[PDB]
Design a protein around this ligand. Structure first.
Ligand SMILES: CC(C)CN(C[C@@H](O)[C@H](Cc1ccccc1)NC(=O)[C@@H]1CN(c2ccccc2C(F)(F)F)C(=O)O1)S(=O)(=O)c1ccc2ncsc2c1
Lengths: 99, 99
């Protein structure tokens, strides 16, 4: 697909039994999802953006489906106001910026 | 150009005769630059990111050349962690997401 940027690039993602709307975000190194209780090991981390930092839980090798494209990798979970698909997963689904 | 996402999509911009590195940020509605001097009236604004809210100065109708593509639009100036080029100017240069 081609997604223009007139509006926020929100797409449907699936993580296990949860479907959520998330930004395809080229300005995000990492994938940051709003609070959810995923299974398995994790590690605490702090990530910074506009306004300062938030504490997140880093889960590794989590499969996520993005517009029917399979991805698997690190997902950060924390008190973000929006779900953010970062470059770690954007590359896996073949996402580029073009102009 | 086509830009892949294994590295941060950092590009050189020209603004007020100055060259700066800025991040092409599809997860950003607006363009937000680190502290700098721009001429003309500005208005105080507050914006919220992942870590909370900050105060910025809003300048309207500012020319920026992004990889040689001309834009003229609103630039917010304040304590962003990184210079970010948001959708207001990404649209002007014809930028889309493709996968
Ligand atoms: C700042 C940038 C270098 C990094 N961020 C990614 C951005 O795309 C971020 C993603 C993002 C989007 C929305 C909320 C929070 C975070 N966008 C924004 O902060 C700004 C806020 N804003 C926004 C939002 C609502 C109203 C007005 C604005 C305004 F437009 F502001 F008026 C908006 O439209 O973009 S991030 O979310 O902090 C981030 C993500 C992953 C990540 N991984 C490691 S550090 C790290 C940091």
């Amino acid at each position: 697909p081609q997604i223009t940027l007139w509006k926020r690039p929100l797409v449907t993602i699936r993580i296990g039994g949860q479907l959520k709307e998330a930004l395809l975000d080229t300005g995000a190194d990492d994938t940051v999802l709003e609070e959810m209780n995923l299974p398995g090991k994790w590690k605490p981390k702090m990530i910074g953006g506009i306004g300062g930092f938030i504490k997140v839980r880093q889960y590794d090798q989590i499969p996520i489906e993005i517009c029917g494209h399979k991805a698997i990798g690190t997902v950060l979970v924390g008190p973000t106001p929006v779900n953010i698909i970062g470059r770690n997963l954007l590359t896996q689904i073949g996402c580029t910026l073009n102009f």
